[PDB]
Curated annotation (Swiss-Prot), chain A:
Self-association state and partner proteins as the record states: Homodimer. Interacts with polynucleotide kinase (PNK), DNA polymerase-beta (POLB) and DNA ligase III (LIG3). Interacts with APTX and APLF. Interacts with APEX1; the interaction is induced by SIRT1 and increases with the acetylated form of APEX1. Interacts with (poly-ADP-ribosylated) PARP1.
Stated role: Scaffold protein involved in DNA single-strand break repair by mediating the assembly of DNA break repair protein complexes. Negatively regulates ADP-ribosyltransferase activity of PARP1 during base-excision repair in order to prevent excessive PARP1 activity. Recognizes and binds poly-ADP-ribose chains: specifically binds auto-poly-ADP-ribosylated PARP1, limiting its activity.
Localisation: Nucleus; Chromosome
Domain BRCT: 2-93
Organism listed in the record: Mus musculus
Taxonomic classification: Eukaryota, Metazoa, Chordata, Craniata, Vertebrata
Null mutant phenotype: Embryonic lethal. Conditional knockout in brain causes cerebellar histopathology including increased apoptosis of cerebellar granule neurons, reduced numbers of cerebellar interneurons and decreased electrophysiological spike activity in Purkinje cells. Mutant mice exhibit cerebellar ataxia and elevated levels of ADP-ribose in cerebellum. Double knockout with PARP1 restores the normal interneuron density and ADP-ribose levels, reducing cerebellar ataxia in comparison to the single XRCC1 knockout mice.
Protein name: DNA repair protein XRCC1
Designated gene of the protein: Xrcc1
Record's comment on post-translational modification: Phosphorylation by CK2 promotes interaction with APTX and APLF. Sumoylated.
Shown residues in whole-protein numbering: 535 to 631 of 631
């Protein structure tokens, strides 16, 4: 076998662009594991998935919805690879220092 | 990993569905790598409906003659058996007295 349900009750917003057909693949995994996709940044959103640099506007999103978590798409790939809900913190996205250096 | 037996197949959900059936159908079609269309356009190969044969279907066939009309049960059974079953077993057709 049956489809796993480890995303049950969790709401995702896919932020921005992803390479190739990766956006469709994210929709596929989120949906397959019973997650809920949101087409807008609304009160129900819990996870913002982004492959991009931190967006300063996320600060306004946080004013409306202080529970938001920002996460890399690798989190969803890994949940699929392991067939279980991994902690999003391991794939978190945070603002980086102005003029931060290469690491 | 996830079966991809709907890969390359385009689906349109036509009409109304009971309970949470629409979301379930979307879940399975998406999970098995099917493609869901917002309109019954030229890319659609499978029209899924819980409703009876409808004059709209006859009109759709005029320019998309290869369309297939199928019951939700088809997608549920593919899931149960984890494989692509023949849609012909679950087809939607006019009642015979209409012929």
């Amino acid at each position: 076998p049956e489809l796993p349900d480890f995303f049950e009750g969790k709401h995702f917003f896919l932020y921005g662009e992803f390479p190739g057909d990766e956006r469709r693949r994210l929709i596929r995994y989120v949906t397959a594991f019973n997650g809920e996709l949101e087409d807008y940044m609304n009160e129900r959103v819990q996870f913002v998935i982004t492959a991009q640099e931190w967006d300063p506007n996320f600060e306004e999103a946080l004013m409306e919805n202080p529970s938001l978590a920002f996460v890399r798409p690798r989190w969803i790939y890994s949940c699929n690879e392991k067939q279980k809900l991994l902690p999003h913190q391991l794939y978190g996205v945070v603002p980086q220092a102005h003029h931060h250096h290469h690491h």
